[PDB]
mmCIF file of C-alpha atoms in Angstrom:
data_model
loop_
_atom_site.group_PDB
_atom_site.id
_atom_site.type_symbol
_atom_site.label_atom_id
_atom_site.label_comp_id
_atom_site.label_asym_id
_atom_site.label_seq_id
_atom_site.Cartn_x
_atom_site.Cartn_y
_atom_site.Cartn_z
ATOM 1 C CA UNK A 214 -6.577 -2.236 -4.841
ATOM 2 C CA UNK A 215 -7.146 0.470 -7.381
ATOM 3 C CA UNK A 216 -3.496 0.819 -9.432
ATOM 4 C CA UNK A 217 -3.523 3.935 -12.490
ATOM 5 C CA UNK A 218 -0.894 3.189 -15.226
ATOM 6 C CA UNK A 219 1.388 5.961 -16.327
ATOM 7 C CA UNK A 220 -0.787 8.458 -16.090
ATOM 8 C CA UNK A 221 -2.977 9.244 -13.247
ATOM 9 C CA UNK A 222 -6.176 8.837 -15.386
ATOM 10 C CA UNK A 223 -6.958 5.809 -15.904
ATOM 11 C CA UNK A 224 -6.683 2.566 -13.420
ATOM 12 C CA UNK A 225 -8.015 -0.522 -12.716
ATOM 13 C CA UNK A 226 -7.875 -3.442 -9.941
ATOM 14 C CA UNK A 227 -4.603 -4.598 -8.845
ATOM 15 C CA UNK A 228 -5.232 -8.647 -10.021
ATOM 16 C CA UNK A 229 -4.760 -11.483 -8.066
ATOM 17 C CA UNK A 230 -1.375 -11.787 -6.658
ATOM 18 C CA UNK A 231 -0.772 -8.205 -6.584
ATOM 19 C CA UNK A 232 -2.360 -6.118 -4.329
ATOM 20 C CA UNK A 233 0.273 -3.271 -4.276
ATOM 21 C CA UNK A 234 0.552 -0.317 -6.693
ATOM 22 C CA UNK A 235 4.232 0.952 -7.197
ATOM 23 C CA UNK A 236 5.805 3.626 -8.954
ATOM 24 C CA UNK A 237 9.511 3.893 -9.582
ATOM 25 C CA UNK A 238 11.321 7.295 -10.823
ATOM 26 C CA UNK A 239 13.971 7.367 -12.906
ATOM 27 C CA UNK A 240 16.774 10.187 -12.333
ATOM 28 C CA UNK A 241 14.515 11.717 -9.620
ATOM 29 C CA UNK A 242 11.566 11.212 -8.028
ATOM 30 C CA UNK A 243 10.746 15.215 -6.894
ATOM 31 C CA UNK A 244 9.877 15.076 -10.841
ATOM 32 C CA UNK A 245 6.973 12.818 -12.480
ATOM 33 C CA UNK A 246 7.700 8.996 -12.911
ATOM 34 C CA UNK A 247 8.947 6.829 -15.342
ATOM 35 C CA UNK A 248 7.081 3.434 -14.832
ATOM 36 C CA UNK A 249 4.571 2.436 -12.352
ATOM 37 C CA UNK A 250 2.070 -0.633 -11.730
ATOM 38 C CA UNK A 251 1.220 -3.192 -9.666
ATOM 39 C CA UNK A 252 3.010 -5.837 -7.262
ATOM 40 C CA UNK A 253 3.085 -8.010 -4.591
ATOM 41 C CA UNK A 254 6.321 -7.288 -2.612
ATOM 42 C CA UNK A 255 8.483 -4.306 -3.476
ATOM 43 C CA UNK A 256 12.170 -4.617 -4.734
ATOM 44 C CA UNK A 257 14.862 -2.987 -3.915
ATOM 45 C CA UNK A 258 15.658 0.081 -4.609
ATOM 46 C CA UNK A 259 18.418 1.930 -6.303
ATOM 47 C CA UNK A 260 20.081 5.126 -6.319
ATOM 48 C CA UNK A 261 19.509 5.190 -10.654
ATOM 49 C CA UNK A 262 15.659 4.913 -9.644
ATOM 50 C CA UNK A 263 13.432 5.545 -6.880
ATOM 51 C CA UNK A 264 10.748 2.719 -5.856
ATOM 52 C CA UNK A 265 7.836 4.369 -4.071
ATOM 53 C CA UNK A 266 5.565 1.466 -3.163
ATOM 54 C CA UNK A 267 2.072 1.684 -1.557
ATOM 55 C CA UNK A 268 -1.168 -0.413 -0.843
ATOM 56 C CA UNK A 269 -3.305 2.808 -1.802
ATOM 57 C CA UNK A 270 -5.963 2.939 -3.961
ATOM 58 C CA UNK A 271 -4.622 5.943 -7.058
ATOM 59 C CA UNK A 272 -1.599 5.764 -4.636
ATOM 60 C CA UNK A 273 0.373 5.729 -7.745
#
């Protein structure tokens, strides 16, 4: 899978292991993110921040 870093640029293969792209939001989501990568099973969530998983390539 094809994950983009902070900006929706640049991106690159999701490694070994991880095969999901993520992207959690802090305050709000509706806005632009805060941190976003790769994983291999998404956490949980919180109210703080908002963890929008996917198994997209540039979902993130």
């Amino acid at each position: 899978l094809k994950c983009n870093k902070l900006v929706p640029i640049a991106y690159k293969t999701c490694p070994e292991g991880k095969n999901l792209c993520y992207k959690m939001f802090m305050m709000s989501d509706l806005t632009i993110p805060v941190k976003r990568g790769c994983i291999d099973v998404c956490p949980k969530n919180s109210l703080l921040v908002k963890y929008v998983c996917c198994n997209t390539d540039r979902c993130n």
